[PDB]
């Protein structure tokens, strides 16, 4: 549970950091 919590977290925390990759390299473009 705490190890498969720790799965869920690092693998949302994957998704977010690599959305925030994408959003920042759109914001490159915007300026």
């Amino acid at each position: 549970t705490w190890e498969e919590w720790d799965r869920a977290i690092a693998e949302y925390a994957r998704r977010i950091e690599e959305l925030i990759r994408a959003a920042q390299e759109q914001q490159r473009k915007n300026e």
Binding site: W5, A13, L19, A22, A23, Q27
Partner: protein
């Protein structure tokens, strides 16, 4: 690309909300082991977690709707894009309230079982203070920019600047969120 970028920001907010719900779970496990009853503010904490959680779900739902509306109108619409910016900002502010509640909870639990003077806790506490100041200043700047863009609806660059504001607030929230996860793991490893 503004509409697409708005979609990625909305997705980041949704994933941050899931991550936040996980931290709330972890805190509740810890609270059941460390605390007795509901005093010291815990009864209110429980209700306020639930109040902001249902507020955030509702803002995410509104944002999704606006997002679909904007995507259907790409070929025609500054006001929909400005509106979506307000939606994203409101979601970010609601998530910041939730985040501050989890910070409060981790601090109360930590003080019961661990010295705040060792094991990374002093640095943790400064970093929490710093990112809290930073996020508040970004939210205030986003509010000011939002008012300016709305003032300019009466028929570009303000919009792009607000995209940057939102993104930077989401980034700072992610750092706060990774500090709360670290706090929880230290407490979990100590007392469970």
């Amino acid at each position: 690309g503004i509409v697409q970028q708005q979609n990625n920001l909305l997705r980041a907010i949704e994933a941050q909300q899931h991550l936040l719900q996980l931290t709330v779970w972890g805190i509740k496990q810890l609270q059941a082991r460390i605390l007795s009853g509901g005093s010291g503010g815990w009864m209110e904490w429980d209700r306020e977690i639930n109040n902001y959680t249902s507020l955030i779900h509702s803002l995410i739902e509104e944002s999704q709707n606006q997002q679909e509306k904007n995507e259907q109108e790409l070929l025609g619409g500054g006001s929909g894009i400005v509106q979506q910016q307000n939606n994203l900002l409101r979601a970010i502010e609601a998530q910041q309230h939730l985040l501050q509640l989890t910070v409060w909870g981790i601090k109360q639990l930590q003080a019961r079982i661990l010295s705040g003077g060792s094991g990374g806790w002093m640095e943790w506490d400064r970093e929490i203070n710093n990112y809290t100041s930073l996020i508040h200043s970004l939210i205030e700047e986003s509010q000011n920019q939002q008012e300016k863009n709305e003032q300019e609806l009466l028929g570009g660059s303000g919009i792009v600047q607000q995209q940057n504001n939102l993104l930077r607030a989401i980034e700072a929230q992610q750092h706060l969120l990774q500090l709360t996860v670290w706090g929880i793991k230290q407490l979990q490893a100590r007392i469970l």
